[PDB]
Design a protein around this nucleic acid. Sequence first.
DNA 1: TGAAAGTACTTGAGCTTAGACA
Length: 545
Amino acid sequence: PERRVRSTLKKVFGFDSFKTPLQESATMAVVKGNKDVFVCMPTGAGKSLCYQLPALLAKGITIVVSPLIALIQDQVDHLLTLKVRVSSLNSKLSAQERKELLADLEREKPQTKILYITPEMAASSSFQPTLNSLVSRHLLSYLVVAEAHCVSQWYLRLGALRSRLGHAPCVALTATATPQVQEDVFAALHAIFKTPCFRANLFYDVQFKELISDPYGNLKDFCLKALGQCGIVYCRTREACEQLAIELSCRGVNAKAYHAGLKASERTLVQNDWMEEKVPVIVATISFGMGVDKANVRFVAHWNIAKSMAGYYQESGRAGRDGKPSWCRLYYSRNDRDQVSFLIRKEVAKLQEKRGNKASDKATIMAFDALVTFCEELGCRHAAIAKYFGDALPACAKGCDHCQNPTAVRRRLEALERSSSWEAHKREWNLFYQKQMQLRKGKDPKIEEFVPPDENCPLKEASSRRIPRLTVKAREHCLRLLEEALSSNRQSTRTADEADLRAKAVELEHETFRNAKVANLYKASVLKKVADIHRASKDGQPYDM
DNA sequence: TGAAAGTACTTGAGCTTAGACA
C-alpha cells in the first residue's frame, strides 16, 4: 500500500514521513505513475530520496538515466548499508566483480533492485548486448538523470534509454530549472514541481574589484567576517586556483585547490579532508558540483564571474544546507566578462564550425549576457533570480546589497562607469578592437547559408569557398557585370558574336576569382577589369585576351 | 635655465573547463 511504502521509508531508511511537499507530490505521482518527472531542488538528501524511495518498490530493477556523471562512488557508498539492494560499478577493477555482476544481471530476477550507470561507460561494448538482454529479460523500470549534464553536456544522447530504449517513466531531479533548460529537458529528453527557493540566508552581494583597491584584503575580511564555522572560492583557471590559494594562505585564510593537473588520488584528500575541517577553504573552477554537499558551508565566493545564471546558481547552491546565514559574494570586473565572452565566442565558434546552428548556440550567449545584466542591473538579487527563473519576485530584506543602502550601491554602480570611460599597445589595441566588435556581433552569430548554384551556373569553380562571404548570387552578379562589359566591347569593336562571349566571361570570372582571396578585393579586381575593357573600347582597338 | 646614460631594485599583472579508456 501507499501508506505501507511511506512507512517502509522509515523501515528502510528511517524517515517517518516526507520532509517537504516536494516529496509528497513527486514521489506520490511516481508511486502512481503518470509521466516524466522533472524536479528542481537543492542538491543533497532530498532529491536523492526522490528517486531512491521509488527504487524501493522498483518492480524488479530500476535503471537510472545517470546519477550525475561521477560521485556515483558516493551514492553506491550511501545505500549498501541502508537496507537496500544497490549496485553501480565503473572503476575498471569492476571486471573482478562487475563481470559476474553482469552475469548477475543476465541472471533473471536478481538480488539487485537498483543499478547505477551513466553515459560514461554504458555506451561501451560491455553493455550494448547487456542493455538489450536486460530490457528483454523481464522489464526495465524508471529512468532518473537527476542532474542537467544531459542537455548541459560535453556523448550525451537525450534519446538514450528513452528514444532508443524508452521502456518506463523518466525522473529528472536536477538543481537548475531555467525556462530554456526545462524546455530542453522536455524536448531533448523527450510530479513536476519546483520550489521557489528564496533562501534569504544566502546574502547575495556583488562587489566590484575595479572599485576595490585591495581585492585580496577585501576577500580576506569577507572570509574572516564569515567566522570560523568551511568555505568555497570560485575562479576560472587552475593557474588562478593556485594563485588565489597561495595568496589566501599567505593572507591567513587556510586555502587550498581542487584541480591543477593533479589527480583524483592527488586531490581525493584535498576534497574529503575539506568536509572534516582539516582543510578550511578550497578553491576550484567547476570541480565542485559534486563531492558530498556538506552542511556547514559558510560562504561561496566567485573571484571571477560564472558562465551563466544557471551556472552561478548551481555553484551557489553548494552552500546553505543549514540555517547558517551564508553570504555568497560575486566579484565582478569589466575586464573579466570581457574575457569570458571572448572565449564563450571562441567556444560557440568551434562548436558551430564542427556542427550546425542550434538553440544552444545562442542559449549560451544570452545566458552569459543575462549573467552580465544581473551583475549590472539595479535591484534585489533574489528578485533578479526569481525573474530569471520566472518565479514570484520576492521583496526580500537584509538579503542583498540593494536592500541595505539605497545610495551606496548606486554610488558604486555609478563609479563603475566612471572607473574607465570609452610594443605594449599592439595587444591592447587588438584586444579592445576584437572585444568591441564582439559587441557588434552580439548574440547568435550564425548566418552562413551558403546556397549552392541553382541549376545552370555559368561559373568555373562555382562551388568554391576559397573566398569567404562570396555567396553564389554575388558571383553570378559579378559575372553579369563582366558579360555586360564584354557585350559593350563587342558593340564598340565589331567582333564575331556573343556566343563565345559567354565562355569568355566565364573564363574571366574564374580567373579573377583565382587571383582574388576576399570578396572586396575580388570585386575590386572585377570592376578593374571592367574599367580596362571600357578603356580599350574607348581607344577603339578590339579587346584582345 | 638648459644639462645623461647605464644599471640595480620593486611589483604586479595575468589565464577555459568539468565527466565515462591502461
